[PDB]
Amino acid sequence: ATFEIVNRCSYTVWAAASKGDAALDAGGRQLNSGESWTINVEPGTNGGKIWARTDCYFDDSGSGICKTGDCGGLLRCKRFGRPPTTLAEFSLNQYGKDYIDISNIKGFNVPMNFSPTTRGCRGVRCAADIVGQCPAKLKAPGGGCNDACTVFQTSEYCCTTGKCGPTEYSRFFKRLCPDAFSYVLDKPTTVTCPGSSNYRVTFCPTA
């Protein structure tokens, strides 16, 4: 499948694309305002994610640090990023269907639009100013708005027993972005698309 990742933000992001134990395509790249990066993702890839990293500083070796989403200090991510990270999540060619969602379960850093560029399903978006409205206890000094599992490490926020309910923190993310997952047992906002669809992930889709 083809993903075109577009930075419409006024600031530079560092895009990342991984399935947890491996890079997807090159794994990461700098995107200046307006730039677009087209990657190829193997069919059948399950549990892929795409996210933005902010305020990175890297050397000529591809090694360094990002204030949000850092993936063990590497430009080219092989693993998932450190919260807070707004996530575009995808499972592809799963019994003939693709499944996509946006998730705030690991917090929010950058607004996002995640849509198919081929026919037969709708896209999803989380485009509200979550960072500006973030509750004081969930503010990340680095930038971003952390989820409450990251911040407090409780069974209830992390849904460690497999039973957990909505919380005052999950409801904050949900009020601002109804179409993203706000906690592990949220009513699914998954979109089912035809198998082998192609997609575009845009950062700051309205901004």
Swiss-Prot record:
Gene3D superfamilies: Thaumatin. It is found in: Cytoplasmic vesicle. One of its GO terms (cellular component) is cytoplasmic vesicle. Disulfide bonds join 9-204, 56-66, 71-77, 121-193, 126-177, 134-145, 149-158, 159-164. Keywords: Cytoplasmic vesicle, Disulfide bond, Signal, Taste-modifying protein. Belongs to the thaumatin family. Taste-modifying protein; intensely sweet-tasting. It is 100000 times sweeter than sucrose on a molar basis. This is Thaumatin I.
